[PDB]
Amino acid sequence: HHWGYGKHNGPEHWHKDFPIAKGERQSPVDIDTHTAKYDPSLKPLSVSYDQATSLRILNNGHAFNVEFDDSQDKAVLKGGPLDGTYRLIQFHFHWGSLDGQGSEHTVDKKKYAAELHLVHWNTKYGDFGKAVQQPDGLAVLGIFLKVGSAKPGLQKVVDVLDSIKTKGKSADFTNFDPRGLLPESLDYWTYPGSLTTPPLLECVTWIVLKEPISVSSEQVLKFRKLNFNGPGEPEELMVDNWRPAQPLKNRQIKASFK
Ligand SMILES: [Zn+2]
C-alpha cells in the first residue's frame, strides 16, 4: 500500500508516510498573479541546453522521466533567482484525465492540461542525492501545457511511450533536445518550495514560466495511454498524476516581469 494518485493512496494520504507533506514550504501552489511582486533585482534566466545528452526514458509508476547524463556540465540552468549552477538530470510531466485539469501549479486558480518539470541539481552538492538534502539543492523549471497546436519538439517523446507502457519499463532515448519544449519567453515566477512527489523534500527553488507551450489533443491523449501498473497487472491508466495546490504559508512569489 504505497503512495500514488488513487482513491486510497492519493495526495491527501501522503502525510501519513511523509509528515513533511504538511510542512512550511510545500509545492505546488496557486500563483496569485496580482499578489506576486515584480522583483527588478531578479536576473534573466540562463538556460544552456546546447550540449544536453539524453540517455533513457523510464516509466517509474508515477510519471515518465527523460533522463540525462549529468556527470558533466552539459545542460545547465543558472541566473534568474539562482546562485550557482544547476545541472539537468531529468524532465517529466504531470497531466489530467481530460484537458480541464492536469497541472500542479495553478495561475489565479486556472488549471492547465499538463505541466512539464525540468529538474536540476546544484553542482555545489556533488550529486542529486546530496542536493535534495539541502534547502537550495534543486531548481525545477515548470512549464504549463495547453491543448491547441502540436509541439513538434514533443513528438519524439510521444512516439516512444508505447514502448514504456508499464511501470519499471525503460527505453533508450538519445539525442533528444529539450530546447524544443521551451516557450518563446522566459518570463517567470519564482518561490521556495518542495518536490511534489514523496519524499516531498523542501529543497526546490521553483521557476515557473508564464508562457505555456501548446501541445495537440493527440499528443496529450498518448500520455493518457500509459499505465501506473506493472507488466501483467490490472490496467490502471496513468492520468491525474498531479498534486493539488498547497498552502502558501509564509512565502512570497516573485515575478521577473511587469
Ligand atoms: Zn514533477
Short mmCIF file of C-alpha atoms and ligand atoms in Angstrom, two decimals:
data_model
loop_
_atom_site.label_atom_id
_atom_site.label_comp_id
_atom_site.label_asym_id
_atom_site.label_seq_id
_atom_site.Cartn_x
_atom_site.Cartn_y
_atom_site.Cartn_z
CA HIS A 1 0.00 0.00 0.00
CA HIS A 2 2.45 2.59 -1.30
CA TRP A 3 1.73 6.17 -2.33
CA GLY A 4 0.05 7.08 -5.61
CA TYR A 5 -2.80 9.11 -7.05
CA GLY A 6 -5.69 6.75 -6.41
CA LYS A 7 -8.72 6.95 -4.15
CA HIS A 8 -6.90 5.31 -1.26
CA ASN A 9 -3.27 6.40 -1.63
CA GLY A 10 -3.51 9.83 -3.24
CA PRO A 11 -2.13 13.23 -2.14
CA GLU A 12 -4.47 13.56 0.87
CA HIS A 13 -2.92 10.36 2.32
CA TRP A 14 0.74 11.13 1.75
CA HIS A 15 1.27 12.87 5.11
CA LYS A 16 0.93 9.55 6.97
CA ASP A 17 4.17 8.22 5.47
CA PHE A 18 5.69 11.65 4.76
CA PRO A 19 4.75 14.13 7.50
CA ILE A 20 6.58 16.96 5.70
CA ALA A 21 3.52 16.94 3.41
CA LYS A 22 2.02 19.42 5.90
CA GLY A 23 5.22 21.46 6.05
CA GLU A 24 6.04 25.15 5.68
CA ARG A 25 7.25 25.17 2.07
CA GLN A 26 5.27 22.59 0.14
CA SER A 27 4.61 22.57 -3.60
CA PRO A 28 2.76 23.13 -5.83
CA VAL A 29 0.96 26.37 -5.05
CA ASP A 30 -1.56 28.65 -6.66
CA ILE A 31 0.16 31.63 -8.22
CA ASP A 32 -1.91 34.72 -7.48
CA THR A 33 -0.70 36.96 -10.27
CA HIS A 34 -1.89 40.16 -8.64
CA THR A 35 -0.12 39.45 -5.32
CA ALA A 36 3.14 38.30 -6.95
CA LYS A 37 5.61 41.16 -6.75
CA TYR A 38 7.85 42.26 -9.58
CA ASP A 39 11.44 41.99 -8.39
CA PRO A 40 13.75 44.12 -10.56
CA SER A 41 16.78 42.51 -8.88
CA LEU A 42 15.90 39.15 -10.45
CA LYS A 43 18.14 38.31 -13.41
CA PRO A 44 17.25 36.81 -16.75
CA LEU A 45 17.10 33.04 -16.71
CA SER A 46 20.05 31.32 -18.36
CA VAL A 47 19.11 28.01 -19.98
CA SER A 48 22.11 26.37 -21.61
CA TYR A 49 20.91 23.12 -23.15
CA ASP A 50 23.00 23.06 -26.37
CA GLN A 51 25.16 20.14 -25.11
CA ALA A 52 22.40 18.16 -23.34
CA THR A 53 22.80 14.40 -23.58
CA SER A 54 19.62 12.43 -23.07
CA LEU A 55 20.05 8.70 -22.37
CA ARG A 56 16.85 6.94 -21.40
CA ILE A 57 13.15 7.29 -20.85
CA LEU A 58 11.64 5.46 -17.86
CA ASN A 59 8.12 4.71 -16.65
CA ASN A 60 8.63 4.87 -12.86
CA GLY A 61 5.00 4.19 -11.97
CA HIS A 62 4.01 7.82 -11.31
CA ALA A 63 5.25 9.55 -14.47
CA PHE A 64 7.82 9.04 -17.20
CA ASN A 65 11.28 10.55 -16.80
CA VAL A 66 13.51 11.53 -19.70
CA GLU A 67 16.96 11.11 -18.13
CA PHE A 68 20.15 12.99 -18.96
CA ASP A 69 23.86 12.40 -18.48
CA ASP A 70 24.59 14.72 -15.56
CA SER A 71 28.20 13.63 -14.97
CA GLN A 72 29.48 16.85 -16.61
CA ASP A 73 28.32 20.46 -17.04
CA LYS A 74 26.35 19.83 -20.25
CA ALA A 75 22.84 21.13 -19.67
CA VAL A 76 22.69 23.84 -17.04
CA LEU A 77 20.33 26.34 -15.50
CA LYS A 78 21.69 29.50 -13.88
CA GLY A 79 20.81 33.15 -13.36
CA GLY A 80 17.28 34.09 -12.51
CA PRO A 81 16.89 33.76 -8.72
CA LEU A 82 19.68 31.19 -8.55
CA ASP A 83 23.14 31.35 -7.07
CA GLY A 84 25.49 29.00 -8.85
CA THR A 85 24.95 26.35 -11.47
CA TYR A 86 22.29 23.67 -11.60
CA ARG A 87 22.58 20.58 -13.81
CA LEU A 88 19.71 18.97 -15.69
CA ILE A 89 19.12 15.38 -14.51
CA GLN A 90 15.62 14.62 -15.87
CA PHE A 91 12.33 16.00 -17.03
CA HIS A 92 8.83 14.64 -16.65
CA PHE A 93 5.22 15.74 -16.88
CA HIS A 94 2.03 15.76 -14.83
CA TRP A 95 -1.28 15.55 -16.68
CA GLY A 96 -5.02 15.01 -16.38
CA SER A 97 -7.70 12.53 -17.41
CA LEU A 98 -9.09 15.33 -19.57
CA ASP A 99 -7.93 18.73 -20.79
CA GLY A 100 -9.51 20.76 -17.96
CA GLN A 101 -7.00 19.61 -15.35
CA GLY A 102 -3.51 18.18 -15.05
CA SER A 103 -1.18 20.93 -13.92
CA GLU A 104 0.21 21.11 -10.40
CA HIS A 105 0.76 24.84 -10.17
CA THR A 106 -2.25 26.94 -10.97
CA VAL A 107 -2.44 30.57 -12.10
CA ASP A 108 -5.25 32.54 -10.44
CA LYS A 109 -6.75 29.08 -9.84
CA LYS A 110 -6.52 28.19 -13.55
CA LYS A 111 -5.53 24.58 -14.19
CA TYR A 112 -3.62 23.75 -17.37
CA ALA A 113 -3.86 20.42 -19.19
CA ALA A 114 -0.38 19.42 -18.07
CA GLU A 115 2.86 20.66 -16.59
CA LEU A 116 6.46 19.95 -17.55
CA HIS A 117 9.16 19.79 -14.83
CA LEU A 118 12.80 20.10 -15.82
CA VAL A 119 14.71 19.03 -12.74
CA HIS A 120 18.21 20.42 -11.99
CA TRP A 121 20.59 19.95 -9.04
CA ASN A 122 23.04 22.41 -7.52
CA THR A 123 26.56 21.43 -8.54
CA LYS A 124 27.98 22.59 -5.22
CA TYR A 125 26.47 19.46 -3.63
CA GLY A 126 28.14 16.94 -5.94
CA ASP A 127 25.14 14.86 -6.93
CA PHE A 128 21.36 14.69 -6.84
CA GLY A 129 21.09 12.55 -3.70
CA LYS A 130 23.08 15.04 -1.65
CA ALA A 131 21.39 18.04 -3.25
CA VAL A 132 17.85 17.03 -2.19
CA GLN A 133 19.02 17.24 1.45
CA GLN A 134 19.71 20.99 1.10
CA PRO A 135 17.26 23.92 1.04
CA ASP A 136 18.84 25.22 -2.19
CA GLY A 137 19.58 21.82 -3.66
CA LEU A 138 17.28 21.76 -6.68
CA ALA A 139 15.98 24.16 -9.28
CA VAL A 140 12.87 23.00 -11.13
CA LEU A 141 11.76 24.76 -14.29
CA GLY A 142 7.99 24.42 -14.59
CA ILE A 143 6.27 24.94 -17.94
CA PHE A 144 2.50 24.80 -18.46
CA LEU A 145 0.92 22.86 -21.34
CA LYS A 146 -2.32 23.87 -23.02
CA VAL A 147 -4.10 21.97 -25.76
CA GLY A 148 -4.07 23.56 -29.21
CA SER A 149 -1.47 23.29 -31.95
CA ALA A 150 1.05 20.45 -31.72
CA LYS A 151 4.50 20.91 -30.20
CA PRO A 152 6.85 19.44 -32.84
CA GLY A 153 9.69 19.07 -30.34
CA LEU A 154 7.50 16.87 -28.13
CA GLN A 155 6.64 14.29 -30.77
CA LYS A 156 9.77 12.14 -30.29
CA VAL A 157 8.70 11.71 -26.65
CA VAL A 158 5.10 10.88 -27.55
CA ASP A 159 6.16 8.24 -30.06
CA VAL A 160 8.34 6.24 -27.64
CA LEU A 161 5.64 5.96 -24.92
CA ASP A 162 4.21 2.78 -26.48
CA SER A 163 7.49 1.08 -25.54
CA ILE A 164 7.32 2.03 -21.84
CA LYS A 165 3.67 1.39 -21.13
CA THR A 166 4.07 -0.20 -17.73
CA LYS A 167 5.93 0.77 -14.69
CA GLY A 168 9.58 -0.18 -14.46
CA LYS A 169 9.91 -0.24 -18.25
CA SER A 170 12.69 1.81 -19.86
CA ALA A 171 13.84 2.54 -23.39
CA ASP A 172 16.93 4.05 -24.98
CA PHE A 173 16.30 7.74 -25.68
CA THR A 174 19.37 9.52 -27.00
CA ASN A 175 19.82 12.83 -28.78
CA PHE A 176 16.62 14.43 -27.53
CA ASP A 177 16.90 18.21 -27.45
CA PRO A 178 14.92 19.73 -24.56
CA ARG A 179 15.17 23.20 -26.16
CA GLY A 180 12.26 22.00 -28.30
CA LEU A 181 9.99 22.11 -25.25
CA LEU A 182 10.57 25.75 -24.27
CA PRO A 183 8.19 28.63 -24.96
CA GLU A 184 9.35 31.87 -26.61
CA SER A 185 9.51 33.92 -23.42
CA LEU A 186 11.48 33.06 -20.29
CA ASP A 187 9.44 35.41 -18.06
CA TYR A 188 8.86 33.57 -14.78
CA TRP A 189 7.53 33.46 -11.26
CA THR A 190 9.75 32.06 -8.51
CA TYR A 191 9.28 30.87 -4.93
CA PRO A 192 10.84 28.38 -2.46
CA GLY A 193 9.17 25.01 -2.35
CA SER A 194 9.38 21.24 -2.43
CA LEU A 195 9.34 18.11 -4.50
CA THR A 196 5.72 17.49 -5.47
CA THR A 197 6.10 13.72 -5.04
CA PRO A 198 7.21 11.78 -1.96
CA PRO A 199 9.58 12.28 -0.21
CA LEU A 200 8.28 15.90 -0.67
CA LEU A 201 11.62 17.33 0.42
CA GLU A 202 11.80 21.09 0.87
CA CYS A 203 14.81 21.54 -1.40
CA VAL A 204 13.48 23.31 -4.50
CA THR A 205 13.74 26.78 -5.96
CA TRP A 206 10.75 26.81 -8.26
CA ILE A 207 10.93 28.73 -11.51
CA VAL A 208 7.54 28.66 -13.27
CA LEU A 209 7.36 30.17 -16.76
CA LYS A 210 4.45 32.48 -17.50
CA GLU A 211 4.08 31.43 -21.16
CA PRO A 212 2.60 27.98 -21.70
CA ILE A 213 3.54 25.73 -24.58
CA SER A 214 0.82 24.39 -26.86
CA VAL A 215 0.53 20.65 -27.48
CA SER A 216 -2.07 18.86 -29.57
CA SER A 217 -5.00 16.87 -28.26
CA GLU A 218 -3.42 13.82 -29.93
CA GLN A 219 -0.17 14.38 -28.08
CA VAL A 220 -1.74 14.52 -24.60
CA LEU A 221 -4.05 11.59 -25.45
CA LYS A 222 -0.93 9.46 -25.85
CA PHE A 223 0.29 10.47 -22.35
CA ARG A 224 -3.03 9.07 -21.11
CA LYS A 225 -2.40 5.59 -22.57
CA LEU A 226 0.44 4.93 -20.13
CA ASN A 227 -0.11 2.63 -17.13
CA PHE A 228 0.57 3.15 -13.42
CA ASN A 229 0.69 -0.62 -13.06
CA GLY A 230 3.42 -3.10 -13.84
CA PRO A 231 3.52 -5.83 -16.51
CA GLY A 232 0.64 -8.31 -16.31
CA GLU A 233 -1.21 -6.33 -13.65
CA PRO A 234 -4.71 -4.91 -13.98
CA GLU A 235 -4.60 -1.84 -16.23
CA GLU A 236 -4.84 1.49 -14.48
CA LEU A 237 -4.31 4.46 -16.78
CA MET A 238 -1.61 6.91 -15.79
CA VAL A 239 -3.81 10.00 -15.61
CA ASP A 240 -4.32 12.69 -12.96
CA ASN A 241 -0.81 12.23 -11.58
CA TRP A 242 -0.82 15.77 -10.16
CA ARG A 243 -0.69 17.05 -6.61
CA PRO A 244 -3.11 19.91 -5.93
CA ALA A 245 -2.08 23.36 -4.73
CA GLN A 246 -0.74 23.53 -1.18
CA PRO A 247 -0.91 26.35 1.38
CA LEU A 248 1.46 29.22 0.60
CA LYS A 249 2.04 29.90 4.31
CA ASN A 250 4.93 32.31 4.90
CA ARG A 251 6.13 32.68 1.30
CA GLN A 252 6.19 35.34 -1.34
CA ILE A 253 6.06 34.63 -5.05
CA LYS A 254 8.24 36.94 -7.06
CA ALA A 255 7.84 37.88 -10.73
CA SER A 256 10.66 38.55 -13.16
CA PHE A 257 8.39 40.73 -15.29
CA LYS A 258 5.96 43.63 -15.00
ZN ZN B 1 7.01 16.95 -11.26
#
